[PDB]
């Protein structure tokens with residue numbers, strides 16, 4: 001079944017149709033040009049939600065919609081995605097996050113990620129979870145290292161789903177294993 005998880009503040013849940021509106025708004029915001037070359041139109045936003053909902057439908061877990069009881073129905077997503085692409089560290093499971101700027105600076109992505117990794121190791125019994133981003137995305141790989149995920153620069157890779165001359169091609173790899181997760 002589609003796993004519903006609970007943080008102290010956050011509800012990690014399956015996506016609803018109403019979430020597409022809120023996600024599209026996030027992805028149209030000029031502040032996303034810090035992370036992406038250009039803002040997303042509704043068709044692009046909807047294309048990613050389709051991938052998320054496909055993953056949930058096929059696997060029973062995925063990047064959970066973030067509900068904040070007392071505040072907002074949807075502030076972004078955080079959760080697990082199967083790595084199936086042809087890279088050195090695949091097959092494995094990655095953790096990813098996209099938060100509305102209004103909810104930055106509150107440890108909410110931190111809380112969401114801890115809840116997802118608790119699920120990853122205690123429930124799914126995964127040997128490891130990975131994360132990857134571009135070198136300039138300090139906010140994203142900052143959260144990875146604050147979670148206790150660790151990077152080997154030797155494991156830097158070209159993203160095989162991006163063309164050769166794509167500026168974001170070069171990615172850095174973070175890992176956390178069941179063992180290191182228990183140490184917190």
Ligand SMILES: CC(C)(COP(=O)(O)OP(=O)(O)OC[C@H]1O[C@@H](n2cnc3c(N)ncnc32)[C@H](O)[C@@H]1OP(=O)(O)O)[C@@H](O)C(=O)NCCC(=O)NCCS
Nearest residue numbers: 026027032035097098099104105106107108109110139140
């Ligand atoms: C990567 C991302 C999730 C990080 O979010 P964040 O809120 O900065 O990260 P955290 O949840 O770990 O919170 C850490 C911050 O909260 C603060 N904080 C306050 N209380 C805290 C607490 N109890 N625990 C942790 N941090 C806390 C920290 O001091 C830190 O502030 P800082 O960034 O100035 O150092 C966010 O920047 C993001 O989603 N970016 C991508 C957006 C995007 O791609 N959108 C496109 C949509 S299509």
